[PDB]
């Protein structure tokens, strides 16, 4: 397969400078355009730059240029970028992208994309969440399922990953987008719907990571 | 300043013909522009589809098509499927750089479908730490508009109550929402009675939940 694995992001202070990296595979990497594209929470794609295979072209997104550095190192087939004179706008999304060109068909696609490195810019200090489980009743049915849950509160800053057994667990699971409370902290759901005459019939464990203060939990979810 | 611009959202029924639009400030889309499409699916999971224009990128779909439409660059869907359910973004090539419009969410049609309803009261654990949070869940409704009203001793609650919603299902279509009223558990102790109540298209009056603290 095409992998762009992402690595560097986490919390930054106000005025801090990072330096995200990105390793491919797969594909001959020194032949390749590459390019850096970020997602702000709940907003759209905004494109930062692109390098060429030889380090030469540079090309930048203008209206925010003396603050972002491109560049690569073909021998470790990775992408780098630079980010400094960090402010709460640059919290976003980052992702590694490459991109396929073709002068003779007049063909410019970004094909392939990282799963993206989360950078928040705060000077909040990071937060582990509780997790706390949202128990399933044999008398609490409806549509002919049973749900149970986990909540999991009180975090900073993003992101957690959620998963049910393992992995192992992906039918009428839901992982809902966290929300921020008023304290200024997070919060999100993640449940589970099961046919109600299974309830029974198998065990229940949310495991939730949370990077940024190195917090892994796995609960089980009893019904009760 | 080149401002892309995209309709915000979109509704189609399976098998049915879609068109996504893109335009620009500067004036008429241009071929000189290179419109390139990308779809967004759940996880953030970006697939280039349109390159050019109208040159489809490999291994995608037939069904995707782009082109230009007076002024705008068009991204066609024709026999649209549950699986297109997604964001597409176009972005246009100007001077040196490519600047991406806002996307539009592909919303694909389906029947009416009632939610069912779950209220959790808070976890032991929890109170033990001097807060209760009770949730409310909607499963696997469509169309997405749903109102959640908060009770509490048969009190409408206000202004201590946040909401959160899935994507669209990429194969039944339907939406899921989560809720959760967050008291202390001093207050957590003052009432008996907690109650989730929604109101639903699919739903011919209100569907109420409810449990009694300590029972």
């Known amino acids: 397969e095409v992998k762009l694995l992402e690595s560097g992001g986490g919390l930054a202070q106000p005025g801090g400078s990072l330096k995200l990296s990105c390793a491919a595979s797969?594909?001959?990497?020194?032949?390749?355009?590459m390019t850096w594209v970020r997602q702000a929470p709940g907003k759209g794609l905004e494109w930062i730059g692109e390098?060429?295979?030889?380090?030469?072209?540079?090309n930048y997104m203008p209206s925010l240029k003396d603050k972002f550095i491109i560049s690569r190192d073909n021998a470790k087939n990775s992408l780098y970028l630079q980010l400094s004179r960090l402010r709460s706008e640059d919290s976003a999304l980052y992702y590694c992208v490459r991109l396929d060109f073709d002068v003779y068909n007049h063909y410019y696609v970004l094909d392939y994309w990282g799963q993206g490195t989360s950078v928040t810019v705060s000077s909040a200090s990071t937060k582990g969440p509780s997790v706390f489980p949202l128990a399933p009743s044999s008398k609490s049915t409806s549509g002919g399922t049973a749900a149970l849950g986990c909540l999991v509160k009180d975090y900073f800053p993003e992101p957690v990953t959620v998963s049910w057994n393992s992995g192992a667990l992906t039918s009428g699971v839901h992982t809902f987008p966290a929300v921020l409370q008023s304290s200024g902290l997070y919060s999100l759901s993640s449940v589970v719907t099961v046919p109600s005459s299974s309830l029974g019939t198998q065990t229940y464990i949310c495991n939730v990571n949370h990077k940024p203060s190195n917090t892994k939990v796995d609960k089980k979810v009893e019904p009760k | 300043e080149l401002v892309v611009t995209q309709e915000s959202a979109l509704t189609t029924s399976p098998g049915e013909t879609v068109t996504l639009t893109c335009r620009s400030s500067?004036?008429?889309?241009?071929?000189?522009?290179?419109a390139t499409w990308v779809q967004e699916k759940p996880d953030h999971l970006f697939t280039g589809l349109i390159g050019?224009?109208?040159k489809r990128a490999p291994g995608v779909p037939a069904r995707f098509s782009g082109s230009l439409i007076g002024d705008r660059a068009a991204l066609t869907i024709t026999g649209a499927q549950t699986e297109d359910e997604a964001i597409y973004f176009c972005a246009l090539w100007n001077s040196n750089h490519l600047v991406f419009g806002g996307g539009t969410k592909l919303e694909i049609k389906r029947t009416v479908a009632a939610p069912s309803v779950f209220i959790f009261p808070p976890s032991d654990e929890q109170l033990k730490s001097g807060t209760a949070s009770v949730v409310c869940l909607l499963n696997n409704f469509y169309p997405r508009e749903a109102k959640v009203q908060w009770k509490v001793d048969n009190a409408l609650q206000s202004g201590n109550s946040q909401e959160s919603v899935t994507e669209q299902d990429s194969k039944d279509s339907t939406y899921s929402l989560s809720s959760t009223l967050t008291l202390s558990k001093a207050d957590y102790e003052k009432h008996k009675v907690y109650a989730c109540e929604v109101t639903h298209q699919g739903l011919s009056s209100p569907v109420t939940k409810s449990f009694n603290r300590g029972e």
């Open positions: 050019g224009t109208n």
């Open positions: 500067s004036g008429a889309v241009t071929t000189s522009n290179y």
């Open positions: 390098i060429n295979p030889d380090s030469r072209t540079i």
């Open positions: 797969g594909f001959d990497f020194r032949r390749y355009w």
